[PDB]
Amino acid sequence: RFLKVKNWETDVVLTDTLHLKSTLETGCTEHICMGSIVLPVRTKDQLFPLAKEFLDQYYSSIKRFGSKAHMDRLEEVNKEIESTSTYQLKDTELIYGAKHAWRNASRCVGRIQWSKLQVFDARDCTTAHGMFNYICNHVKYATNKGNLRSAITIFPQRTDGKHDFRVWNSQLIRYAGYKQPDGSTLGDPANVQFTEICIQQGWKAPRGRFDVLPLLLQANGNDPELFQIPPELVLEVPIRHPKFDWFKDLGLKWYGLPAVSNMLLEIGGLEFSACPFSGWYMGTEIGVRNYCDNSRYNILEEVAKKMDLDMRKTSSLWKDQALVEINIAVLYSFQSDKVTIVDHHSATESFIKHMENEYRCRGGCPADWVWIVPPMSGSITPVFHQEMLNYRLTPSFEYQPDPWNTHVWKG
Amino acid sequence: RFLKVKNWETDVVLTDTLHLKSTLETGCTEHICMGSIVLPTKDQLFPLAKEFLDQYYSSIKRFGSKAHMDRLEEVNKEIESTSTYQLKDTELIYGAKHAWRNASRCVGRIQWSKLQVFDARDCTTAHGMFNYICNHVKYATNKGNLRSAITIFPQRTDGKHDFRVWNSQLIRYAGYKQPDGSTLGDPANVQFTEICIQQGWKAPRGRFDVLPLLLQANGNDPELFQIPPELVLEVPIRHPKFDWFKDLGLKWYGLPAVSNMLLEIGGLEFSACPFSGWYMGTEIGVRNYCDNSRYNILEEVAKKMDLDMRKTSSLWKDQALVEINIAVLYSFQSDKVTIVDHHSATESFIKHMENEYRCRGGCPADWVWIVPPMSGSITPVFHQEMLNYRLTPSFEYQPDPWNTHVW
Ligand code: HEM
Ligand code: HEM
Ligand SMILES: Cc1cc(N)nc(CCc2cc(N)cc(CCc3cc(C)cc(N)n3)c2)c1
Ligand SMILES: Cc1cc(N)nc(CCc2cc(N)cc(CCc3cc(C)cc(N)n3)c2)c1
Ligand SMILES: [Cl-]
Ligand SMILES: [Cl-]
Ligand SMILES: [Cl-]
Ligand SMILES: [Cl-]
Ligand SMILES: [Zn+2]
Ligand SMILES: [Zn+2]
Ligand SMILES: [Zn+2]
């Protein structure tokens, strides 16, 4: 079966066949679409087909499907599963797997870059101190003095589910949030709960607006431990505006390296519960979401006020005007300090090119429109009018519960 | 079988029970989400009729009453004998209001129950259709103080006697391909414009030529009619800060009136059912003016503002976009023509949605269409999870009649 998507701006029609290789579930049924819902120990038995499906894909990609080396590897994995209940990936399979999880990441507009991922294999890691060292190296390598490079660091896989490696931080680098007695928040409200955990664990909180959180690292199912990322490794950019001289006096800065550390990487049935990965920012992630969400730094009012906009009626589009100026400021600051950043026009244009190429060469490109369309100016970017098909290919990145809800403490 | 939606800005969580009444298909499967796709017998009729009449009698607190039973019997009898049935006026008004209520892509539904329904089931000719439409337009326009309305033509019978309004909206501007290679007017209407020329229309060949109505009664060949110009309220577009904005020569019409959809009530199919409300500002300023395949004026506006168009990262497209939208809202307000901005419209919808959750147990909504085409994230709908499903009565797409019609 073939599925058609249409672009309503250009009338270009593409044909998807890759959806036939789809696996997991969307949450949707013929009766209900869950397209806008944010989130809607394995047996030997369920594991070998998963392994096989993965290794069949791996060996096709290297043009060795059905080769002696292919069968030998299937047999080797099969026996290892039977006698040990799990199996180890070759380095080459791991690299390929992490790259494909990104390639398959339907919410990611940045996928044109998928093949250039630097994979750091941390499967020899055994302690939280080991994790900390691996994470510092990742940070330094990815940052590259502002010339950012994609990377992922992969810690040992789940075994019985009692010995998990986890990074408790949702991102490697993020700012503390502190709820005050008066009900206000200092710093980033997204991180209040995790900040409190850190404090409870012994972190001495500076209690400022932009305090870099410490890492909270769990190795081998042990209790997690606190570590400070060396400050010289944390690249940050003061935010200023090219024409508004008062913008700098807002006191804003952001970190250059977005590094997601709470997701789970699934390859060939194996579960990597600590697999921090990083790229670089699209400007609206900072300018629209991090600054302008009401549940975040919430700076729209303060900026529009300084701009002396008419704020008595929403219909002046004062919020829209301020939003734009803030995003201009974020891009200007990054570019001036020579830190890699991408504007939403540029990122979406790239993504459409990526997507068309994927249809030709791969037979599809699963994509979640709700996430792909940028959070401002949606319609004047080339993704808005692009029909997309969302489905789940493995290898993949998945959500997992926050470890503070599931962890068994030892003391 | 009891579904939760979260708002990620407020943490508020809501429970949907209304979806277990969902009926038609989404296009999606367990394996694949088609959420961003724009278009994904007597035996048939009676269950549909019964399903409808049951919800009607439930709504007027009369479920399982004699009058409920007898109506079900009456309709059953009429289907057996006639192969169809006629709605009571009360059923028609409820069906129409509920079709709007159930429109999952419409942000403006807080108004659903105030719809003014014009029953045009006695219409027999295209001239009749024209009279009914002019009346609808004048009533809805109301000298700028817009009121929602629908006008309902006779229902489908055998499918070779369909009433259709061939236009997509009652009021729209002509589209012309020029020897130049380019497009004068609205590129969205190029094809339909040629059908007008082909059927005899004297096109003025301007940028904002209000198209003639092209009407099909009783499955007959369609006919041309021009709406009285004094009934088409238009608004010149100016900016409250930029004096030069007027010289772009821009105007838009005040009345948005979708005329190409099909209204399904209790299995009955109303192929001609133009309905109208009033504009959300972004519809004109973002879509109609700024889509590349529409009036596409972004480049021109940015030039006038003297922005640096050398690189995308100056956000010149975004600056111009905002300004254009400010000017649309300003111009409509100054001429006292109803219009809503996207902040106001989405806040109203969030109020409505919560109302529907507590009183009806749910509100089908399609996030892809509900989130405005600019500044999505700073409106309260962006962070609102929504459930999309099909309830009946409904509005449905139907194919363009020139592909269907035989002469
Ligand atoms: C290199 C430049 C990259 C850019 C510009 C980029 C951009 C984005 C954006 C903008 C989003 C979510 C929409 C939003 O935040 O507004 C996103 C989501 C995501 N990205 Fe990428 N990304 C990049 C690299 C990567 C890498 C290296 C990976 C993994 C190896 C990755 C995996 C993901 C995943 C799994 C999501 C969905 C997250 C979730 O569901 O919460 N991205 N990306
Ligand atoms: C009263 C003011 C109204 C407002 C502000 C409004 C707003 C909107 C908007 C903004 C959209 C599409 C999203 C976009 O254009 O960006 C839409 C779609 C729609 N509206 Fe409403 N509307 C109104 C009245 C009505 C009425 C009176 C009806 C029917 C009685 C209706 C039925 C629909 C339907 C069926 C769609 C989807 C059209 C399609 O799928 O192509 N609306 N509305
Ligand atoms: C590796 C990488 C690089 C890069 N540049 N950006 C990312 C994504 C990071 C991200 C982090 C958070 N906290 C939230 C979102 C979207 C939150 C969201 C989006 C939508 C569309 C709806 C909703 N409710 N929430 C995305 C990853
Ligand atoms: C009665 C009524 C009142 C009112 N104020 N507005 C309307 C909507 C009319 C409308 C007409 C057209 N041609 C296109 C769209 C959206 C086109 C669109 C939206 C999205 C989200 C994606 C896509 N591809 N196309 C909407 C109806
Ligand atoms: Cl972020
Ligand atoms: Cl968000
Ligand atoms: Cl329109
Ligand atoms: Cl559109
Ligand atoms: Zn779906
Ligand atoms: Zn947000
Ligand atoms: Zn558009």
mmCIF file of C-alpha atoms in Angstrom, chain A residues 3-5 8-9 19 22-26 28-39 288 292-295 300 314-317 319-321 323-325 327-328 331 335 343-346 369-370 375-380 384-385 387-392, chain B residues 3-5 8-9 19 22-26 28-39 286 290-293 298 311-315 317-319 321-323 325-326 329 333 341-344 367-368 373-378 382-383 385-389:
data_model
loop_
_atom_site.group_PDB
_atom_site.id
_atom_site.type_symbol
_atom_site.label_atom_id
_atom_site.label_comp_id
_atom_site.label_asym_id
_atom_site.label_seq_id
_atom_site.Cartn_x
_atom_site.Cartn_y
_atom_site.Cartn_z
ATOM 1 C CA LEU A 3 0.173 6.729 0.963
ATOM 2 C CA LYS A 4 0.135 10.214 -0.566
ATOM 3 C CA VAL A 5 1.002 13.521 1.125
ATOM 4 C CA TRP A 8 -0.774 22.917 -0.405
ATOM 5 C CA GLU A 9 1.640 25.738 -1.300
ATOM 6 C CA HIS A 19 4.957 3.326 6.771
ATOM 7 C CA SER A 22 5.987 0.758 11.121
ATOM 8 C CA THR A 23 5.983 -0.990 14.507
ATOM 9 C CA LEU A 24 4.870 0.568 17.819
ATOM 10 C CA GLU A 25 1.557 2.493 18.270
ATOM 11 C CA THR A 26 0.470 6.096 17.620
ATOM 12 C CA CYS A 28 -4.705 6.952 17.377
ATOM 13 C CA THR A 29 -7.630 4.803 16.257
ATOM 14 C CA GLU A 30 -10.220 5.101 13.424
ATOM 15 C CA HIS A 31 -12.441 6.701 16.099
ATOM 16 C CA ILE A 32 -9.973 9.097 17.733
ATOM 17 C CA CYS A 33 -6.843 11.008 16.701
ATOM 18 C CA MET A 34 -4.383 11.581 19.532
ATOM 19 C CA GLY A 35 -2.126 13.593 17.205
ATOM 20 C CA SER A 36 -1.864 16.474 19.709
ATOM 21 C CA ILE A 37 -1.411 14.393 22.904
ATOM 22 C CA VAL A 38 2.159 14.949 24.153
ATOM 23 C CA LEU A 39 2.552 11.408 25.676
ATOM 24 C CA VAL A 288 9.429 31.718 21.946
ATOM 25 C CA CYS A 292 7.858 33.703 26.383
ATOM 26 C CA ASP A 293 5.832 30.740 27.725
ATOM 27 C CA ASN A 294 3.734 31.821 30.719
ATOM 28 C CA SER A 295 4.977 28.821 32.709
ATOM 29 C CA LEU A 300 6.679 39.244 27.029
ATOM 30 C CA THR A 314 -4.651 42.356 22.545
ATOM 31 C CA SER A 315 -5.683 43.588 19.075
ATOM 32 C CA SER A 316 -2.643 45.892 18.749
ATOM 33 C CA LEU A 317 -0.668 42.635 18.402
ATOM 34 C CA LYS A 319 2.451 40.374 22.227
ATOM 35 C CA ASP A 320 3.288 39.445 18.608
ATOM 36 C CA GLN A 321 5.536 42.496 18.230
ATOM 37 C CA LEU A 323 7.768 38.154 20.571
ATOM 38 C CA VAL A 324 9.474 38.971 17.282
ATOM 39 C CA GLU A 325 11.912 41.491 18.826
ATOM 40 C CA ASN A 327 13.628 36.294 18.833
ATOM 41 C CA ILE A 328 15.604 38.782 16.746
ATOM 42 C CA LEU A 331 19.596 35.155 16.961
ATOM 43 C CA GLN A 335 25.604 35.017 15.720
ATOM 44 C CA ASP A 343 16.520 30.516 12.614
ATOM 45 C CA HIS A 344 13.139 28.838 12.030
ATOM 46 C CA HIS A 345 12.952 29.815 8.314
ATOM 47 C CA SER A 346 16.279 28.280 7.655
ATOM 48 C CA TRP A 369 3.301 18.299 12.244
ATOM 49 C CA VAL A 370 2.336 19.536 15.695
ATOM 50 C CA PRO A 375 5.882 28.051 17.617
ATOM 51 C CA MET A 376 5.697 31.434 15.874
ATOM 52 C CA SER A 377 5.028 32.495 12.282
ATOM 53 C CA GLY A 378 3.931 28.955 11.451
ATOM 54 C CA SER A 379 2.231 29.693 8.127
ATOM 55 C CA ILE A 380 5.108 31.587 6.402
ATOM 56 C CA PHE A 384 2.936 24.557 7.621
ATOM 57 C CA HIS A 385 1.484 23.593 4.211
ATOM 58 C CA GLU A 387 1.106 17.235 4.867
ATOM 59 C CA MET A 388 2.988 14.726 7.020
ATOM 60 C CA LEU A 389 2.504 11.136 8.079
ATOM 61 C CA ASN A 390 3.338 10.266 11.609
ATOM 62 C CA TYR A 391 4.349 6.712 12.486
ATOM 63 C CA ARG A 392 6.906 4.993 14.758
ATOM 64 C CA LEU B 3 -9.772 10.039 27.919
ATOM 65 C CA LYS B 4 -7.644 12.748 29.488
ATOM 66 C CA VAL B 5 -6.241 15.940 27.942
ATOM 67 C CA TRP B 8 0.896 22.143 29.561
ATOM 68 C CA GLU B 9 0.786 25.835 30.436
ATOM 69 C CA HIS B 19 -15.819 10.617 22.175
ATOM 70 C CA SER B 22 -17.895 9.434 17.865
ATOM 71 C CA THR B 23 -18.982 7.897 14.621
ATOM 72 C CA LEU B 24 -17.417 8.544 11.168
ATOM 73 C CA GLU B 25 -13.680 7.729 10.564
ATOM 74 C CA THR B 26 -10.538 9.811 11.410
ATOM 75 C CA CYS B 28 -5.828 7.347 11.416
ATOM 76 C CA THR B 29 -4.879 3.811 12.448
ATOM 77 C CA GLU B 30 -2.908 2.372 15.399
ATOM 78 C CA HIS B 31 0.073 2.366 13.039
ATOM 79 C CA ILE B 32 -0.312 5.790 11.419
ATOM 80 C CA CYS B 33 -1.533 9.269 12.271
ATOM 81 C CA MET B 34 -3.182 11.282 9.524
ATOM 82 C CA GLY B 35 -3.764 14.263 11.815
ATOM 83 C CA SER B 36 -2.086 16.679 9.398
ATOM 84 C CA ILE B 37 -3.822 15.455 6.212
ATOM 85 C CA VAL B 38 -6.320 18.061 4.924
ATOM 86 C CA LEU B 39 -8.632 15.446 3.272
ATOM 87 C CA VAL B 286 -1.480 35.659 7.341
ATOM 88 C CA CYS B 290 0.983 36.033 2.803
ATOM 89 C CA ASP B 291 0.728 32.453 1.544
ATOM 90 C CA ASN B 292 3.091 32.119 -1.439
ATOM 91 C CA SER B 293 0.206 30.711 -3.502
ATOM 92 C CA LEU B 298 5.409 39.772 2.191
ATOM 93 C CA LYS B 311 19.349 36.972 5.479
ATOM 94 C CA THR B 312 16.426 35.065 6.946
ATOM 95 C CA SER B 313 17.778 35.464 10.478
ATOM 96 C CA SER B 314 16.935 39.193 10.739
ATOM 97 C CA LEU B 315 13.313 37.903 10.945
ATOM 98 C CA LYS B 317 9.413 38.035 7.146
ATOM 99 C CA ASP B 318 8.187 37.925 10.741
ATOM 100 C CA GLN B 319 8.309 41.711 11.248
ATOM 101 C CA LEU B 321 3.900 39.576 8.923
ATOM 102 C CA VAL B 322 3.014 41.228 12.224
ATOM 103 C CA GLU B 323 2.620 44.662 10.633
ATOM 104 C CA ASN B 325 -1.838 41.744 10.621
ATOM 105 C CA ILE B 326 -1.933 44.890 12.703
ATOM 106 C CA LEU B 329 -7.274 44.466 12.423
ATOM 107 C CA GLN B 333 -12.051 48.156 13.551
ATOM 108 C CA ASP B 341 -7.793 38.834 16.702
ATOM 109 C CA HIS B 342 -6.214 35.428 17.256
ATOM 110 C CA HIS B 343 -5.511 36.071 20.963
ATOM 111 C CA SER B 344 -9.131 36.943 21.668
ATOM 112 C CA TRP B 367 -5.123 21.283 17.063
ATOM 113 C CA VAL B 368 -3.560 21.631 13.592
ATOM 114 C CA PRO B 373 -1.055 30.430 11.691
ATOM 115 C CA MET B 374 1.133 32.986 13.513
ATOM 116 C CA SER B 375 2.406 33.301 17.087
ATOM 117 C CA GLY B 376 0.944 29.832 17.896
ATOM 118 C CA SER B 377 2.832 29.338 21.138
ATOM 119 C CA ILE B 378 1.750 32.589 22.775
ATOM 120 C CA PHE B 382 -0.989 25.878 21.743
ATOM 121 C CA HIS B 383 -0.389 24.149 25.081
ATOM 122 C CA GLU B 385 -3.992 18.897 24.225
ATOM 123 C CA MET B 386 -7.111 18.224 22.081
ATOM 124 C CA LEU B 387 -8.920 15.085 20.926
ATOM 125 C CA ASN B 388 -10.050 14.949 17.356
ATOM 126 C CA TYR B 389 -13.062 12.823 16.416
#
